[model samples]
Target: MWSHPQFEKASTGREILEKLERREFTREVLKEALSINDRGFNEALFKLADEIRRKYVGDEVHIRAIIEFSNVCRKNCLYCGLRRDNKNLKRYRMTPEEIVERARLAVQFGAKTIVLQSGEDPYYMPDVISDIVKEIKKMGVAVTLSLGEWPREYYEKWKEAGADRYLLRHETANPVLHRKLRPDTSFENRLNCLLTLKELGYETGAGSMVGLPGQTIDDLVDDLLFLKEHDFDMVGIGPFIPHPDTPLANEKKGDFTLTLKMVALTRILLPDSNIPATTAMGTIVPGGREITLRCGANVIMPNWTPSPYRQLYQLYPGKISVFEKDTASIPSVMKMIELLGRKPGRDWGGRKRVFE
Candidate 1:
């Protein structure tokens, strides 16, 4: 009874609501759901997403510590401020020692996972990243690398050094748009990286941006299907905030409602996966993160990248990255979680895999 044509009418579309209770939906069924503009339908969508989120992942909100270790990138994506050619941005790197110390401090703050993120800079080569991963793993918390592409051997080396997860956002699913926005990369190559990460036994993560300038609703449905099919342990969906220095500077920002809809749909499709109420969420609205938490998000990443450099890691404008001292951000994040009536997660916050 749950089929694509049912989404054509409100009652049947309302009928579509019950289908998610069984975790049963096809790509065509979701494409129709994504095209909807009715408020009543969306309200039901978000509410059902929240209910299923609770049923599968529980009410505990996971908090991951993120350290944006460098801004020196090798690619010139049209949308990022850190694009290789951006002369206006200052680039810096923390020595492996400093990065490991930051990981130690994150542990002191009771973080169960430390995300060491950087743009693709050859300066931090395989041996360099391997040493950092080795030290961070010794702390007993899970280690994740967001350092962009490297030789396949580099991935293997990092895994051997004890890296537990990898975060790679596919960014967009439209191959044509992908080539335009990230001129140096292709959709096939981006997926190849994700596929390689999974093949290496890493708890792989992939995400998509909500409103790239030329993006279509069809593109987003492709994104949802991509997430579902990959079975990625983690999926991040965030609104597009154009950087002032990027080529897309004059473009309009992604609508918050559409971003929420994408997040809610992703939750319905991949209920047991970890989904973050991204830091970008809060940047765009007052209590934006709180609003996301109410809908379907269950994770919050408090970026604790060390100061001065943290402010300079400008992926976008109006970002909420002013916290300088590491400890300054942790207590505030914990307070926010408590205020939301949801307890902060105390474990590694990996995928729950409850159904399988």
Candidate 2:
């Protein structure tokens, strides 16, 4: 039988860390923890996770509006739908004015943080992005740029242009496995981009895919340990879903329970860091966002573009099912949080928790 008493009785950070390090969160562990079907183990984890969140993060769910400005990308990541080789995707590039217009709408909807995410479109230069940031900042919305890789000088220029955060998910830290999965991508380039973002005074973010092809338990450990060492201001972790048109499309989807376990582990490791229940997680399981929040997540990102454009953007397969189109409407997004017993935060980009 699963023994919570033993888990709770364990003292010291090393002990707790060891519990997480043991790889104790396997399928059986999930079965034991989430034994009840309806309620799941959410109540138990929430009791502990909430106390930890309050002690470290307090009760605030940072919400951001993501403006997916473009789908044109240059690189061909074997798993992404918008890779250069894939002719299946519909592509469009929003001009700087169009991006600023979206930011204005996001702010009017009470969103203080605006994240400009796009594929690795080589056509978008630093000067162009810097000008966009300047325009968005003028609208009083904190800006986060998620355009794929670029030169260090470009990152610096965007930072100089008033952009406050830059997100480039390390995706995975195991270079050998990364090379195997994204054969065309370089692990060093991704890491350097993250480091460069930090040097440019941006709140850097690094993340990994939970269950990618050839992923091993050791890889998960490496990812967690990497995050602990690097200590980024933000970490985005979620399940990996194969896009139907991608090379890895036939691979099985990632486990939802493991994703939740990662959430709890992330909270314990970086209690002050901002973690979001990515759209991929929600796509993996219905109401998955709620499970993540109860586990340790404290952020949610709702799309701000017009509903017509929402369907045109596809980062991965199985993205639309979790949305429940009707429920995913902005107002419903807020209601979902209320129904889940958490309060949505109004703070925008790069907002940090002030721990007492």
Candidate 3:
């Protein structure tokens, strides 16, 4: 492609793309890749990511069901609606039995993996979460935990309880930005949590938000390198949507094109990692989830958090979900997946597959 003189006139953009394809993943090259703005180059990046996706992970689109069970968070992160200082947000926590039953319902709806998501709430202690994980594991679906930081032994207990994955978002690779956005939660502490998850042998996941106040392309490059260096089994790349209740209410939303580029680059860096079509992406742009699926994302996580609690668990504004019968919709989702020429993953869809 770069052989054409006119296309080569397109600047060093094509050369950087070539470098990425050549697997020369130096920081300068990655930063240059992130800086490319040509339409032709970007389209090729997304297309190349899709080809790589097909080569390594095949055509099965894993639909992991997410149930946001709690909105009660103690950490007052400046960018989230569920932060400790947000008195405008009503908080609710489900009984352990309620969570288990919802997992059962989701499994019946054809979810091979159930992500039990919540804020950093201590009310549901290690034993309570273990019981829920045990119940879901019995239903023959892989379980992923997205709760915030906890003690080392707590992760050990959950791993023994049969949890198959854990997704703790680093949010950004720039430690200064991470600390600025999420005060009281140091970057080192979050990094250690991710390491602990890996050591415990869970199919560990680490994610980063595409944009936030003070974020730079260098930060995104570091995020991509972080995933590769740690060998994360799964990653969630989503746009940062500002919440009205948070301190960053006036900050501009993460750029959609940059977010897409981040997804595509991450896919290239970690070809085998399970990348999700995050709900936040769909919320920010119409048909966003489908677009991500075409480029590189192979996972769709439908929010099954039921009723009033679902609305209450607003991490950002304009989140998509049905109010009545909120714990619903895997059938429609499967239809969409099929329409995309991809099939729903019938098995557990664990990132660390033991077999082909």
Candidate 4:
């Protein structure tokens, strides 16, 4: 039986190595172990994390830019900042030509992939998205899509239009828990979307949140198992932050420490999948993203939208606006990766390999 390790004051290198040897990390074990809350334990775990990263992945870090074209969403996710109820947010939609120009800018900055993320707005039909993707691919940049719950034909159209990747976070694999957090979303629909993306020959990326309300270690462990069974090309895991406007607004935010641990575990588990240090992780703590990179996360998505539209693309509350808020820049992100003794990956390919 898997059991949580007991620690009094701090966890040492020995403790970390022991836990790894035992493979006793269930969701409950992780939660119980995390409850210890020792700074010394975190430092040791970070060191262990660094070792795992260097041993399997080496130093190549991926940087992708997300240009949120619009915030006009049809669904009203309880935790989303761009939910239909967020009327205070200004909405804007860019023409296909405008998307092409911005993608060109990302390419000039050495970005091989340009991810176009937006809320699910009925206004932008499948043909419009396909046209935008076609224009982007003409610039020799791989286009990744984050448009929510679309029909299978829509996904096929985008892939045929030269879209290379499709990202849709499962959010939670437990249906009961999934329904509790995201009432309007469906687990089956999200999984079907991922399968459709895979079948369309596009690299598929799926993920879930940590510390979401009603989540447990069992749910996370099950999620990891699901990822392994599916053999996905990419996986993104991040801490869940509460949005002030949502019904669950008063719920506690995810713990930064546990989020980091999960990042390392995901890397070790899915060594070849492209794992990202998400914006939510960065928002939770100042240097949380940097820590994630060190803990075997190889991808960083700094926002690249025009400064004026940056703030309008908030997925969760308190999202970090890179171009508008100046939390981080392309140049600064590069420098920071170097300072951590890791190389920022310049090339964009399929998914990052697990081992160098």
Q: Best candidate per TM-score, number?
A: 3
Candidate 1 residue runs with Cα over 4 Å from true position = 1-9, 22-24, 323-326
Sort all candidates by TM-score, best to worst: 3, 1, 4, 2
- With a 3 Å backbone cut-off (N, CA, C), the pairs that clash in candidate 1 are none
Residue range 235-285, candidate 3, lDDT tens digits: 899999999998999999998888988889888888888999899889888
Residue 308's C-alpha lDDT in candidate 2? Answer: 49
* Candidate 4 lDDT by residue in tens digits, 1-356: 89997454543435544675366555554544444466666666566656766775567787777888888988887778888887877888877777788788877777778899888987777998988888888887778998988988898888889989988988889988877666787788788888888888888998888888888877777777678678778788898888876776898888887878777666655666788888889898988888788776878888887766777777777685543443346666788788988787756756755554
Give the better candidate number (2 or 3) by TM-score.
Answer: 3
Residue 227's lDDT within candidate 4 is: 80
TM-score each candidate: 0.94, 0.85, 0.95, 0.88
Off by over 4 Å in 3: 1-11, 353-356
Better of 1 and 3 by TM-score: 3
Prediction 2 global C-alpha lDDT: 0.74
Candidate 2: list runs displaced more than 4 Å: 1-47, 321-328, 349-356
Cα-based lDDT for every prediction: 0.86, 0.74, 0.87, 0.77
Residue pairs in collision within model 2: 113-348
Ranking by lDDT: 3, 1, 4, 2
Pitting candidate 1 against candidate 2, the one with the higher TM-score is 1
